[PDB]
Every structure is written in C-alpha cells, then in structure tokens.
Amino acid sequence: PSVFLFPPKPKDTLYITREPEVTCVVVDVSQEDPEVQFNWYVDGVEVHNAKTKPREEQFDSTYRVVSVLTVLHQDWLNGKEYKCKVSNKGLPSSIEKTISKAKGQPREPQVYTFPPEQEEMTKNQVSLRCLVKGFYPSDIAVEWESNGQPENNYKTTKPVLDSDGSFRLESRLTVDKSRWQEGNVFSCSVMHEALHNHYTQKSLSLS
C-alpha cells in the first residue's frame, strides 16, 4: 500500500499561462477499497483545493487513487514544501510524503546540437541530438520545433549527475531523411528557470 508524490512538469512552472500541479498517487494491490483520505499542506499549512479522483483498477489489477494539488508558479520556484498525507476513512494511522524544489544556486544549461552521423544517411529516418549540461536544479523541459511548429518524435534521457553537482541530459529527434535533405531548420528548445526568460533554442540544418 504505497504513496508516490510527483513534482510539477518543469514546463508548467516556467510559463505563467500554464497550470503547474503536484500529484499524489496511492497504489494498492488489495481489491478491498479502504476509502483513502488525502490531507495536503504547503509549508506545514493545510490547504483544501486538491482534486481527488475515484479509486480505479490498473492494467496489472492493482488499484490507484490520484490527488492533484494546483500550485502557484512562484511557490514551487521559491522552494515551498508540498506534503501529501494519506489515511483510510476513520482510521488514524497515516503515510506521508514531502517534495520541494532541490536547494542550491540555480545554474544555466549549456546547449549543444549534433547532425546525424553520416553512416545513418543511408537510413529512411535520421536522428538529431541535443545535449544539455551544467544545469541546476534538475527541473528542465526539452522540446523540438521546425518552421514554428512542434516535433513530437523525440526521446529524452533522465537527468544524470556530473561530478560538480550539475545535471545533464540528451534528447534525440527522429525525422524522415527527406525532411533533413530539403534544408529544414530543426530547433532544440530548452526551458530552465536559470535561463533569461526561462528559454533558449539552438538550431541545426544541412549546409
């Protein structure tokens, strides 16, 4: 009977028109609905604006209950503590979790792009690489774009810790070789709190 607490999507905290939320999940292998209750707290003060969904059966036959707490962009970025406490109805025993933005001087990402490797120029689909390093905290969003429109066909690694305490990750965008050959510009878009206006972009095209 275990509880998970997830931070907001990094993009949501960095763009004020987005709706960042923290997410509390209860996973339970037992059919018996124990009628879980959530208490939420921001820096130890209970709040009441969480939206909790009904118990649902998962594909693996376990049961999960999801509770979402809307958060203020600055509240997350200023290191406020989000506490999820879970109770079965009228039974005082409880499990809690706490998360918060990691502490430490924010550091700006450095962004590198790489064209496809030439022994890949024999394939129908080629890869573009965006390497991002030197950043703190780990909270970051990496996306791609071309001709002012999003590219969805990318995979991004989990953040890895370098030995100076800053993080790094790599994204790879897979596109049809014809698109790369026709001279289209592909932008790696990087969103991090330590970047000016939380955004920078590096661009890649054939010459």
Numbering used by the authors: 238 to 444
Paper text:
Here we report a structure-guided approach to engineer monomeric Fc molecules to adapt multiple versions of half-life extension modifications. The pH-dependent Fc–FcRn interaction is a key contributor to the prolonged serum half-life of antibodies and their derivatives. Past efforts to engineer a monomeric Fc, defined as one set of CH2 and CH3 domains, have proved challenging due to the extensive interactions to be disrupted in the CH3–CH3 dimer interface.
Crystals of the aglycosylated MFc3 protein grew readily and diffracted to 2.4 Å. MFc3 in the aglycosylated form (N297D) was crystallized in the C2221 space group with cell parameters a = 102.97 Å, b = 110.93 Å, c = 87.18 Å, Matthews parameter VM = 2.49 Å3/Da with two polypeptides in the asymmetric part of the unit cell, and solvent content of 50.62%. Superposition of MFc3 (orange) with a previously resolved structure of MFc2 (or C4n) (light purple) shows that both maintained a similar monomeric Fc structure, and the S354E mutation did not cause any notable change in the Fc domain structures. Aside from a minor change of the R405 side chain position, all the other original sets of dimer-disruptive mutations in MFc1 aligned nearly perfectly with each other. Importantly, this crystal structure demonstrated that, as designed, the glutamic acid side chain substitution at position 354 indeed protruded out and disrupted the kind of interaction we observed in T1. Using solution analytical methods and crystallography, we demonstrated that S354E was able to sustain a monomeric Fc structure, and the glutamic acid side chain protruded out as designed.
